[PDB]
Amino acid sequence: EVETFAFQAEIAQLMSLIINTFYSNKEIFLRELISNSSDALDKIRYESLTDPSKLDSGKELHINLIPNKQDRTLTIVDTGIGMTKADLINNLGTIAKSGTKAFMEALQAGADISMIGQFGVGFYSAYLVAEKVTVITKHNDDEQYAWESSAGGSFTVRTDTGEPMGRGTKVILHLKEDQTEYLEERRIKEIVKKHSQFIGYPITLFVEK
Ligand SMILES: Cc1cccc(Oc2ccc(N)cn2)c1C
């Protein structure tokens, strides 16, 4: 059972701008997704200071980067607080609406795409390099869900029957055919070292077999 939803008009406009605009500095997608993972891990860490049982679904707080050349996917996994069904349908889009309006006003005033994180909508930079994005997430208070969008104005949500995650978020980037450089180890290492060197969680870059 798969539910299909329309993005709000403003978010569809931002995604289309990100996919169509000529912008060479695409590597900032990884900084934005890692930053999103680090915020999610801060949240579950804080909540567990006053409620240690919130870590029953997983004590480890980390980030894993997994390239897969056979599937042409780059996966960013965190064990953060994860996302509920309401987040995927309502809450994230509500905050992304005003962040998108501020971001697009700044772009006409001279700002550039690399500042997208300053407006809270850094996740959409994944469409600089991905033709489709799948998100598997599990929050302590809800079930495991799969979110997916190839842009074009819509996204889907379904209950995930795959491997149980425990807690956290998995962002699967189905890469465009001409962005496979972000599957190379030496390239991911360079981006992480340059943009995410001080993240206060262990970042493990997996190697391909
Ligand atoms: C994981 C994540 C974080 C922030 C935004 C985001 O996109 C979304 C998600 C849901 C709706 N309604 C609109 N944009 C995603 C997938």
From Swiss-Prot:
One of its GO terms (molecular function) is GTP binding. Changing E32A: Strong ATP-binding. Strong interaction with HSF1, HIF1A, ERBB2, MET, KEAP1 and RHOBTB2. No effect on interaction with TSC1. The keyword Ubl conjugation applies. The keyword Protein biosynthesis does not apply. One of its GO terms (cellular component) is neuronal cell body. ATP binds at N36, D78, K97, F123. Residues 1-209 are annotated as: Interaction with NR3C1. The modification N6-acetyllysine is found at K43, K69. ISGylated. S-nitrosylated; negatively regulates the ATPase activity and the activation of eNOS by HSP90AA1. Keywords: Acetylation, ATP-binding, Cell membrane, Chaperone, Cytoplasm, Host-virus interaction, Hydrolase, Membrane, Mitochondrion, Nucleotide-binding, Nucleus, Phosphoprotein, S-nitrosylation, Stress response, Ubl conjugation. Molecular chaperone that promotes the maturation, structural maintenance and proper regulation of specific target proteins involved for instance in cell cycle control and signal transduction. Undergoes a functional cycle that is linked to its ATPase activity which is essential for its chaperone activity. This cycle probably induces conformational changes in the client proteins, thereby causing their activation. Interacts dynamically with various co-chaperones that modulate its substrate recognition, ATPase cycle and chaperone function. Homodimer. Identified in NR3C1/GCR steroid receptor-chaperone complexes formed at least by NR3C1, HSP90AA1 and a variety of proteins containing TPR repeats such as FKBP4, FKBP5, PPID, PPP5C or STIP1. Forms a complex containing HSP90AA1, TSC1 and TSC2; TSC1 is required to recruit TCS2 to the complex. The closed form interacts (via the middle domain and TPR repeat-binding motif) with co-chaperone TSC1 (via C-terminus). Interacts with TOM34. Interacts with TERT; the interaction, together with PTGES3, is required for correct assembly and stabilization of the TERT holoenzyme complex. (Microbial infection) Interacts with herpes simplex virus 1 protein US11; this interaction inhibits TBK1-induced interferon production. The TPR repeat-binding motif mediates interaction with TPR repeat-containing proteins like the co-chaperone STUB1. This is Heat shock protein HSP 90-alpha. It comes from Homo sapiens (Human). The chain holds residues 16 to 224 of 732 of the full protein.
